[PDB]
């Protein structure tokens, strides 16, 4: 809105969170987040549209403006010493660089590797 800051980044959902209570923000790997009060370590509330409500900080991945998402269709083990990253299908991840060699540079939260751009969709 024009009475909050103009935002660069987001966040992405990475695996599905099942609501324990009413006020728990329910969503699947993918969904678009924007994140109202990071202040405790071990819940963030966060706001899906209209939605809004608690979640694990660990369940979403940040995005940059500009960056590109994906989620994984083909489960495929790479090659690590040149800098490939296995990945399972369902798995979302945040693009890093460009296209080179039918691969792209990717970020799982945890890792950042190489893989195979057939393999992956945009989201
Ligand atoms: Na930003």
Redesign the pocket.
């Known amino acids: 809105s024009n009475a909050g800051f103009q ?3 987001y966040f992405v959902a990475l695996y599905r969170f099942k609501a324990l209570e009413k006020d728990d923000l329910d969503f699947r790997p993918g969904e678009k987040i924007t994140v109202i009060d990071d202040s405790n370590e071990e819940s963030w509330r966060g706001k899906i549209g209209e939605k809004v409500g608690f979640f694990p900080p660990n369940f979403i991945i940040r995005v ?2 500009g960056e590109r998402v994906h989620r994984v269709t083909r489960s495929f083990v790479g090659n690590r010493e040149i800098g490939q990253i296995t990945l399972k299908k369902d798995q979302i991840v945040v693009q890093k660089g460009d296209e080179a060699g039918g691969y792209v540079k990717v970020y799982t939260g945890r890792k950042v590797g190489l893989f195979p751009t057939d393999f992956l969709e945009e989201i």
């Open positions: 935002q660069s980044h940059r403006a």
